């Protein structure tokens, strides 16, 4: 399948990690899948596209993020 969205689960919004591919094809599905793939309490979720990644595969330019217990906040 083709990959549109990626996510990371980090300890806070200023920490970076290698992007993991999502199966979702829309943003609303990506948010639901990313919340369901979150392992831990208290972590931060970021979602981005292929253009959100640097050359090392790190998710640095997320299009939306979600602090634990809060709603998704889009960049714009």
UniProtKB/TrEMBL annotation:
It comes from the Bacteria. This is Uncharacterized protein.
